[PDB]
């Protein structure tokens, strides 16, 4: 049935079996503050939820699937027919010459979705000027539009209760009440040593932990994914730390034992 409409860095599809076995048995509303591709969100298909991400282009994708599914599919079908390296390169440069400012939100959504489907590794990346800088891919699937899926996600969103937010995670959890369930999947701590990053800092990791604690002290179930780093071990030392994969690939923290 439902699943992510796009590939995304840190996507949790493969981890679903483990997560499904650790989610609380009963809860109220659902929250996913670093939504990304939404693997869990779409797997749960909550009737009342709250999703958020700092990346504005990604959220626009969610908003347009909800609001203009038909037009989105039409445009995607056009990109599909004219697909070529040359085509890709000219559409990509739109964010370097003000054309991007003249494009509608739905047109912008179609542009990014198309690019991710045909570029190198389906990677989302921009340069210091916020311009997309990923090259064209090789031997990719010529089928890049999934019509029924988009239509389905749209129907679902429009028939339920969903709050779509853009901005910092902290702002997206203000309405948390006792019994709600929140799943956090922030950018992982790199494997003390200072580190370069895309945006989330260790200082932020601290802030996040503080927020985790606050929510726990209020009566909500919280889940958090991160790397198997010692810092992670020290940080949530007061909680139920789960280890995943022998060589231990990653960690999942909970404020409970169901
Ligand atoms: C690790 S990925 C989420 C992956 C998602 N679990 C999956 O299933 O597709 C982390 C997300 O955090 C978002 N993010 C980064 N900094 C943030 C911040 N300060 N507040 C909220 N979201 C943030 C990133 O844009 C990225 O989408
Ligand atoms: Hg996107």
From Swiss-Prot:
Q: Does the keyword Lipid metabolism apply?
A: no
Keyword set, alphabetical order: DNA-binding, Methyltransferase, Restriction system, S-adenosyl-L-methionine, Transferase
Example of a GO MF term: S-adenosyl-L-methionine binding
Q: Which Gene3D superfamilies match?
A: Adenine-specific Methyltransferase, Domain 2, Vaccinia Virus protein VP39
Which Pfam family would be a valid example here? Answer: MethyltransfD12
EC number annotated for this UniProt entry? 2.1.1.72
What are its GO biological-process terms?
DNA restriction-modification system; methylation; mismatch repair
Name the catalysed reactions: a 2'-deoxyadenosine in DNA + S-adenosyl-L-methionine = an N(6)-methyl-2'-deoxyadenosine in DNA + S-adenosyl-L-homocysteine + H(+)
Query: Can you tell me which residues bind S-adenosyl-L-methionine?
Result: 8, 12, 37, 53, 168-169, 185
Q: Subunit details for this protein?
A: Monomer. Homodimer.
Entry similarity comment: Belongs to the N(4)/N(6)-methyltransferase family.
Q: What else is known?
A: The DpnII restriction system has two different methylases.
Stated name of the protein: Type II methyltransferase M1.DpnII
Organism for this UniProt entry: Streptococcus pneumoniae
């Amino acid at each position: 049935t439902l699943q992510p409409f796009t590939k995304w860095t840190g996507g949790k599809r493969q981890l679903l079996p483990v997560i499904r076995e650790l989610i609380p048995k009963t809860y109220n509303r659902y929250f996913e503050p670093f939504v990304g591709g939404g693997a869990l969100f779409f797997d749960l298909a909550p009737k009342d939820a709250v999703i958020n991400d700092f990346n504005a282009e990604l959220i626009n994708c969610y908003q347009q699937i909800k609001d203009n599914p038909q037009e989105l599919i039409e445009i995607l079908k056009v990109h599909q027919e004219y697909n070529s390296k040359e085509y890709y390169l000219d559409l990509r440069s739109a964010d370097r010459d003000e054309r991007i400012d003249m494009m509608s939100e739905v047109q912008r959504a179609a542009r990014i979705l198309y690019m991710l489907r045909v570029n190198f590794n389906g990677l989302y990346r921009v340069n210091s000027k916020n311009q997309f800088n990923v090259p064209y891919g090789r031997y990719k699937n010529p089928k890049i539009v999934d019509e029924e899926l988009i239509s389905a996600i749209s129907v679902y969103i429009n028939n339920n209760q969903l709050e779509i937010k853009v901005g910092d995670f902290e702002k997206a959890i203000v309405d948390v009440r006792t019994g709600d369930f929140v799943y956090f999947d922030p950018p992982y701590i790199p494997l003390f040593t200072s580190y370069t990053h895309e945006g989330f800092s260790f200082a932020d990791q601290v802030r996040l932990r503080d927020a985790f604690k606050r929510l726990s002290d209020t009566g909500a179930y919280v889940m958090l994914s991160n790397s198997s780093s010692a810092l992670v071990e020290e940080l949530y030392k007061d909680f139920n730390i789960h280890y995943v994969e022998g060589k231990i690939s990653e960690i999942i923290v909970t404020n409970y034992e169901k």
